[PDB]
From a paper:
The spike (S) glycoprotein of [name]-[name]-2 mediates receptor recognition and viral entry into cells. It forms homotrimers protruding from the virus surface and, once engaged with the host-cell receptor–human [name], undergoes a substantial structural rearrangement to fuse the viral membrane with the host-cell membrane. The S protein is also the primary target of the humoral immune response during infection. A large number of [name]-[name]-2 neutralizing monoclonal antibodies bind S protein, especially its receptor-binding domain (RBD), providing a basis for vaccine development.
Author numbering:
A (entry chain A): 972 to 1068
B (entry chain A): 14 to 69, 77 to 241, 245 to 247, 255 to 294
C (entry chain C): 295 to 620, 641 to 676
D (entry chain A): 730 to 827, 848 to 874
E (entry chain C): 972 to 1020
């Protein structure tokens, strides 16, 4: 389009001519908005995959004792201490080596 | 006027390096603790500019072409340089831009002048009431058809004569954007003998000259008529190029660092 | 507000829970424009009293800055032959802020009147002189066909029809000599399918509009960062901070909340921007003041109501906005209207935010 | 969890424009699809905190008399002397992980606050 | 476009003029169908998980 501000388009081109340039802004900004939403939905699958993995480690490593290898961390697991962290969680694992 | 100075001669085109020179505020936007990247006509870092000087038995005032923009480097003591003369043919055939420095404001006169081969301005009678004021006009014999006139903002300058190495430094940038002439000025004291020192400074906006004249070449106005001599000063001429810089803006709205990404 | 949820969910039964309907936004109640006193006035009517106007490339201009075009003498109302205007009128230029104003005077033909547009092409634009992109004004013309036009053409005024390249905004070429006409340089003297660049008017009083001389006055404008000192004959309107208003500061028109800022601007810097390259803070052109530019507060409207078969009680929630209009309580999520604040802690039923939950109880 | 975002289709594309708002009605339900998509994200990001941070609904407290067998848990346990409830290890966790939130709300992008605050998440821990 | 029904476009504008409005309907429905397929692939990853 001519400019990103709609006031610059309405102050120059005629109302019939301005609708063409505004549609270029709408189609582009919508595609830009659809791209953002698409990326957020794709990243939503990774944050939920990590949350289900964190909830699994929270259950097995913290609450109980997991015999799974390289799950609660290297070595024979003993106890896990969860710690709050921004936009996530930090696990402190006690291992036997 | 038409006769040059007895000490006027052509110096060899030596070159010197400009460490950070060519950095200036691109606009009036204030920014704090952010890194902004802009692209305009700039002087690349670690470049080579012509090495010129003028004294009272060597005087050099060559005419240099103006294409992509010019960078001004003025090392002064008593502030000899009063400005620069701009124009296409630098005569009455077309418009000509001049810069008059009275150590108060910057006078820009765009008119049709009759060009003298060695432009000069008479400064005489220092016995009483020196004042270091300009009086006589040896630059142009006649003046007419003025399409533009401007007066800048006042500033401070010390015209007292000094001895030893260089002291004052005035770095200017002249460019043509869509006919609008944007001149950017910076003035700081330095300790320099020859060449250029390694340092960093930003050029503040000086004047806006929406004139629109075409300028294919420029000459320098050094002034302080074969009997008239010049003072002790050195001057360098740079060339602007379309380079992209990364500017570091501090909390006070100044440039604390600059990076040329087209160099290394 | 319960029925607003019904039209949102497209059903006549609203289940218990929090539902978003509309988006609350504060409209500006005032227009604040603050600029210093009047210095000079632009020559809007001073160029209309001239005897005659020069040619297209010879146009006369007088530079009077400080925006604020002379509104006392206005000849722009039905005083001339025809008026083709763009943007805002000279009467409306009082509400805009300009740096430098050039009053231009030139004579063209009828076909070249429609060719005048801000920063556009044309026979007089890319060849003689091109107007800058900043022109918001009116193109004023008068009919000279009964005065300047002569029988058999008027050769007094001149114009350059051809040039080797198109001009940029605010660029001029006054050379009348023989130069390149088309895309192929003919190397000086006319020939080799080139033409003589300079041309003369063919004005005939007996032909149509296209051959009629029209004296045109164009006011060149500057939208750049240099501040304007005056807006309108009525300027202030009294700035009151902490309110949603429509502001024009230093030539930047916007709508938002005005707050005082402690930022120190460089004397050569008019206004700041944020990391998003949007207006952040501006400086007062009248006195020394730093105004932080913030947009007017807005947020979503959430309707908190139980099931349709339970009760019709509705709790309106404003997200991240303070309610200045207005059981009006304020939480970290925002203004909550229609609910009561209980200091006791209960199991969360309808979640709100920041650890606040709503429920329907006695 | 990730930052909860809510975007309005009209205000992000063209705001304060009546003529442009009519041009959005010709393009169909894109508002409904994009709004419910981002709204569905903000809900799932809140469900991630409920399925991870708080496993049980019963709160347990640390006894005043401490004999652990030689271990020192003062690092992992919260400090009541601080104005906010956090442990000595969470001191570095919160500080080393970096307003911009209000800056996004200036362009029309609404950032929804989380349901579980820092005090509520630390209590579950 | 003028009308969502293609028959209204084919029965009104000329074949050269109809190609302008038909391209608006096709491209819009291609984006509407591509958005559907994209959302189904995302839900496909959720249901396979």
């Amino acid at each position: 389009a001519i400019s990103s501000v709609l006031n610059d388009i309405l102050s120059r081109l005629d109302p019939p001519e301005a609708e063409v340039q505004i549609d270029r802004l709408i189609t582009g900004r919508l595609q830009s908005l659809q791209t953002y939403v698409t990326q957020q939905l794709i990243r939503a699958a990774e944050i939920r995959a990590s949350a289900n993995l964190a909830a699994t480690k929270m259950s097995e490593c913290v609450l109980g004792q997991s015999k799974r290898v390289d799950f609660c961390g290297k070595g024979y697991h003993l106890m896990s201490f969860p710690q709050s962290a921004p936009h996530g969680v930090v696990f402190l694992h006690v291992t036997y080596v | 006027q038409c006769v040059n100075f007895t000490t006027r001669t052509q110096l060899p085109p030596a070159y010197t390096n400009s460490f950070t020179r060519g950095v200036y505020y691109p606009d009036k936007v204030f920014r704090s603790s952010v890194l902004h990247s802009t692209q305009d006509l700039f002087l690349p870092f670690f470049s080579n500019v012509t090495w010129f000087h003028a004294i009272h038995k060597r005087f050099a005032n060559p005419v240099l072409p103006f294409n992509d923009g010019v960078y001004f480097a003025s090392t002064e003591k008593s502030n000899i340089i009063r400005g620069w003369i701009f124009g296409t043919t630098l005569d009455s055939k077309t418009q000509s831009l001049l810069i008059v420095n009275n150590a108060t404001n910057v006078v820009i006169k765009v008119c049709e002048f009759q060009f003298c081969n060695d432009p000069f301005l008479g400064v005489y009678y220092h016995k009483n009431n020196k004042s270091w004021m300009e009086s006589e006009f040896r630059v142009y014999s006649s003046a007419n058809n003025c399409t533009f006139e401007y007066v800048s903002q006042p500033f401070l300058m010390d015209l007292e004569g000094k001895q030893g190495n260089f002291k004052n430094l005035r770095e200017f940038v002249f460019k043509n954007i869509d006919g609008y002439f944007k001149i950017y000025s910076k003035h700081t004291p330095i300790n320099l003998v020859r060449g250029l020192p390694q340092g960093f400074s930003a050029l503040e906006p000086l004047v806006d000259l929406p004139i629109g004249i075409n300028i294919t070449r420029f000459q320098t106005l050094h002034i302080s008529s074969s009997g008239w001599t010049a003072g002790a000063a050195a001057y360098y001429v740079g060339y602007l190029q379309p380079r992209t810089f990364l500017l570091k803006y501090n909390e006070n709205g100044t440039i604390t660092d600059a990076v040329d990404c087209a160099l290394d | 507000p319960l029925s607003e949820t019904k039209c949102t969910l497209k059903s006549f039964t609203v289940e218990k829970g929090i539902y978003q309907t509309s988006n609350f936004r504060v409209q500006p109640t005032e227009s604040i424009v603050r600029f210093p006193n009047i210095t000079n006035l632009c020559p809007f009517g001073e160029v209309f009293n001239a005897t005659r106007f020069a040619s297209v490339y010879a146009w006369n201009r007088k530079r009077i800055s400080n925006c604020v075009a002379d509104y006392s003498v206005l000849y722009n109302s039905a005083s001339f032959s025809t008026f083709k205007c763009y943007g805002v009128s000279p009467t409306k230029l009082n509400d805009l802020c300009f740096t430098n104003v050039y009053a231009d005077s030139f004579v063209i033909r009828g076909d070249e009147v429609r060719q005048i547009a801000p920063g556009q092409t044309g026979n007089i634009a890319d060849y003689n002189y091109k107007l800058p992109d900043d022109f918001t004004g009116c193109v004023i013309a008068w009919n000279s066909n009964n005065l300047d036009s002569k029988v058999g053409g008027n050769y007094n005024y001149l114009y350059r029809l051809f040039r080797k390249s198109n001009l940029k905004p605010f660029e001029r070429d006054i050379s009348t000599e023989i130069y390149q006409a088309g895309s192929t340089p003919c190397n000086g003297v006319k020939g080799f399918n080139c033409y003589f660049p300079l041309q003369s008017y063919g004005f005939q009083p007996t032909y149509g509009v296209g051959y009629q001389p029209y004296r045109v006055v164009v006011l060149s404008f500057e939208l750049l960062h240099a501040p304007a000192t005056v807006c309108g004959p009525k300027k202030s309107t009294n700035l009151v901070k902490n309110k949603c208003v429509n502001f024009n500061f230093n030539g930047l028109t916007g709508t938002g909340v005005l707050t005082e800022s402690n930022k120190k601007f460089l004397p050569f810097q008019q206004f700041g921007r944020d990391i998003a390259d949007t207006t952040d803070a501006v400086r007062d052109p009248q006195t020394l003041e730093i105004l932080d530019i913030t947009p007017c507060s807005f947020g979503g409207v959430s309707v908190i109501t139980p099931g349709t078969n339970t009760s019709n009680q509705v709790a309106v929630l404003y997200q991240g906005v303070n309610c200045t209009e207005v059981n009006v309580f304020q939480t970290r999520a925002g203004c909550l209207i229609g609910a009561e604040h209980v200091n006791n802690s209960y199991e969360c039923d309808i979640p709100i935010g920041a650890g606040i939950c709503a429920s329907y109880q006695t | 969890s990730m930052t909860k975002t809510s975007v309005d289709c009209t205000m992000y594309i063209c705001g304060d424009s009546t003529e442009c708002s009519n041009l959005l009605l010709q393009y169909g339900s894109f508002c409904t699809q994009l709004n419910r998509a981002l709204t569905g994200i903000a809900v799932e990001q809140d469900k991630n905190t409920q399925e991870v941070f708080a496993q049980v609904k019963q709160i347990y407290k640390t006894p005043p008399i401490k004999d652990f067998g030689g271990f020192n848990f003062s690092q992992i346990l919260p400090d009541p002397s601080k104005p906010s409830k956090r442990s000595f290890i969470e001191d570095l966790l919160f500080n080393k992980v970096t307003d911009l939130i209000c800056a996004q709300k200036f362009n029309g992008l609404t950032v929804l606050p989380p349901l579980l605050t820092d005090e509520m998440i630390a209590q579950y821990t």
